[PDB]
Design an enzyme around this catalytic site. Structure first.
Site: not given
Ligand SMILES: *C(=O)[C@@H](NC(=O)Cc1ccccc1)[C@@H]1N[C@@H](C(=O)O)C(C)(C)S1
Length: 640
Positions: A384
């Site tokens: 992300s």
């Molecule tokens: C970016 O990395 C996003 N990740 C996902 O949508 C995948 C995911 C992985 C584990 C649990 C749920 C979803 C978003 N960014 C992360 C982050 O910033 O750590 C989140 C878990 C907030 S979703």
């Protein structure tokens, strides 16, 4: 003249056999041992070449300016210039002479001692003296040693002064408990084939204070390579190992008695660190009196190498990983100075260079967490954090309105029914989402929609401005970052997944810190730098300055807003702009999906530092954000 070209074939075949190391085949090309022909027998030629050329490690015989004339009815004189490589460097412009012979139809060489070296006369002898070069040091940006040479305390036992029975078993147990050693390890060491009862059998290189020595235990001082950080910088610095005969066969200018870098910067900078061997290669007559000096020069110790690394930041970044799989890269983004390149788990480079057990190396090599990997140079899906790049591209081409509010219902979304059962997912069911809210909550659906609205063409136009496909000028082996496997996505799903950093993207942590440096230089990418004396290189107009002034305030809210994903970092009370990430990978071993945690953070006030930390195959509730507090405090305090 029809046989002159046939003699040039044999002379070229003679020097080719010497160049190839086949001294027997070169000796077969001589004629008969007479007074005005061959000065020695065939088998004696094999020995003379094997003894002399082997003593000097002669390799790579190259000739030039071959002149084969006619002297008599059976004598065809020849001459040429030649050069060769020895253990003391390149021996240039050697003027060789001699004659040839052809009685029936075969042309042979009238071998003479001057065909080994120009000035040889019969019973002349060759002498070689060498002096080892001291290996250069690897130092940090403040002169602190990262790879140096020091005095080491080597523990060992003499099997004679241990005892005979019972007393020998008791003294072995006393040493085993005084230095943390297995009783089977001591008995296996003193029972090898090379061990004599009066010999010194080395055991362990102790690094702390010397404890009480039991019976038979003695400690001798030996000089060797030492790494003050150890595991904290093992992947970056590397280790040196004993030089083998195969290494000498590849590069004779190495020291047969010295060390050679096997991995890391020790191997990448081996030539600058090892220096050049000094000594003299001379010819003597039968009396041992020096006749001619072929090669002579003094020893040049290896150069020191100053890195941009901060030794204190390297140890802090590595210890913050707690021995789990991950890596951390810290830079000064305005210059590119790599302050830390930590990788975890790690191996002991001191134990590695001071002789390691076969099972201890097997434990490193078969550890599923793989401590030998340089994770700061391994490509990963960025996660992300890559939304910063996608947002900046959308702002530059006018696709993303920072104030436009998308209405998103639920946690799943797809473009239309052609996507099948696949949907982009998010974690926070926020109905009204704009760019700021999307960065605070890390909303994949927002970025996926903005990426699809942008289109692959405009997306790649902004992406191609970065360092995808570029080879960074760094002394670290790595592959270029890639957008996808091919030049086209050929899939709306793959385009959207790339939008939030989860497609076929592969970017190593070092390349991530390079791309993310645009947010600390008003859209100017600053290439990373590991050698301190190197000149700063950058690329202008990677993203617009307007996008930076829009995204960076939102990145402050990722820390400061009460619902930001990096809100735990607000406890520091320091100016922070951050972006988190959690990627999902399919490891077919356990089949259950694996997750990689990510964290990007830098100082938005002074642009003094910037870090990119990550955890590979993270445990539940573990993250890179909850581990960066100590490193952020140090970087904010010392780099402004
Ligand atoms: C970016 O990395 C996003 N990740 C996902 O949508 C995948 C995911 C992985 C584990 C649990 C749920 C979803 C978003 N960014 C992360 C982050 O910033 O750590 C989140 C878990 C907030 S979703």
């Amino acid at each position: 003249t029809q046989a002159v070209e046939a003699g040039e074939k044999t002379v070229e075949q003679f020097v080719q056999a010497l160049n190839k190391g086949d001294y027997n085949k070169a000796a077969e090309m001589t004629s008969k041992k007479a007074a005005n022909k061959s000065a020695l027998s065939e088998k004696e030629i094999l020995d003379k070449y094997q003894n002399i050329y082997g003593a000097a490690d002669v390799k790579g015989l190259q000739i030039s300016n071959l002149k084969v004339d006619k002297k008599d009815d059976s004598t065809y004189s020849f001459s040429y210039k030649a050069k060769m490589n020895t253990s003391l460097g390149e021996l240039k412009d050697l003027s060789y002479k001699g004659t040839l012979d052809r009685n029936d139809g075969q042309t042979t060489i009238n071998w003479q001692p001057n065909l080994v070296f120009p000035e040889m006369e019969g019973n002349d002898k060759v002498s070689l003296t060498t002096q080892e070069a001291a290996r250069g040091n690897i130092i940090d940006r403040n002169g602190e040693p990262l790879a140096t040479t020091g005095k080491l305390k080597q523990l060992g036992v003499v099997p004679s002064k241990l005892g005979d029975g019972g007393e020998k078993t008791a003294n072995i147990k006393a040493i085993a408990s005084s230095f943390d050693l297995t009783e089977d390890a001591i008995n296996q060491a003193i029972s090898q084939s090379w061990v004599q009862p009066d010999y010194f059998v080395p055991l362990k290189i102790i690094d702390g204070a010397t404890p009480e020595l039991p019976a038979g235990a003695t400690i001798q001082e030996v000089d060797g390579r030492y790494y003050p950080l150890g595991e904290a910088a093992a992947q970056l610095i590397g280790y040196v190992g004993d030089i083998t005969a195969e290494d000498i066969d590849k590069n004779p200018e190495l020291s047969s008695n010295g060390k050679i870098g096997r991995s890391g910067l020790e191997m990448a900078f081996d030539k600058d660190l090892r220096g050049t061997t000094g000594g003299k290669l001379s010819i003597t007559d039968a009396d041992g009196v020096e006749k001619k000096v072929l090669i002579e020069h003094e020893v040049q110790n290896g150069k020191d190498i100053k890195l941009t690394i901060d030794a204190k930041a390297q140890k802090t970044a590595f210890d913050s990983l707690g021995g789990k799989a991950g890596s951390t890269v810290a830079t000064t983004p305005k210059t590119g100075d790599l302050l830390a390149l930590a990788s975890s788990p790690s191996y002991d480079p001191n134990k590695m260079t001071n002789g390691i057990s076969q099972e201890d190396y097997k434990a490193y090599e078969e550890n599923p967490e793989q401590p030998f990997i340089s994770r700061f140079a391994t490509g990963y899906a960025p996660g992300s954090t890559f939304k910063m790049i996608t947002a900046a591209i959308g702002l530059d081409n006018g696709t993303i309105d920072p104030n436009e509010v998308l209405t998103i219902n639920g946690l799943k979304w797809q473009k239309d029914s052609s996507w099948g059962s696949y949907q982009v997912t998010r974690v926070s069911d926020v109905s009204q989402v704009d760019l700021k809210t999307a960065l605070i909550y890390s909303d994949n659906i927002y970025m996926a929609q903005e990426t699809l609205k942008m289109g692959e063409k405009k997306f790649r136009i902004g992406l191609d401005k970065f360092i995808f496909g570029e080879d960074l000028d760094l002394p670290i082996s790595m592959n270029p970052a890639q957008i996808s496997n091919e030049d086209s996505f050929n899939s709306d799903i793959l385009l959207a997944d790339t939008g939030y950093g989860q497609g076929e993207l592969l970017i190593n942590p070092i390349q991530q810190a390079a791309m993310y440096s645009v947010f600390a230089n008003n859209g100017t990418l600053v290439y990373p730098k590991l050698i301190a004396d190197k000149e700063t290189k950058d690329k202008k107009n990677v993203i617009g300055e307007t996008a930076v002034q829009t995204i960076v305030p939102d990145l402050r809210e990722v820390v400061q807003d009460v619902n930001g994903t990096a809100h735990s970092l607000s406890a520091l009370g320091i100016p922070l702009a951050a972006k988190t990430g959690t990627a999902e990978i399919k490891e077919k071993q356990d089949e259950k999906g694996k997750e990689n945690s990510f964290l990007f953070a830098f100082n938005p006030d002074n642009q003094g530092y910037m870090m990119v930390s990550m955890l590979e195959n993270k445990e539940d509730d573990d993250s890179a954000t909850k581990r960066a507090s100590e490193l952020l405090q140090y970087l904010n305090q010392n780099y402004q």
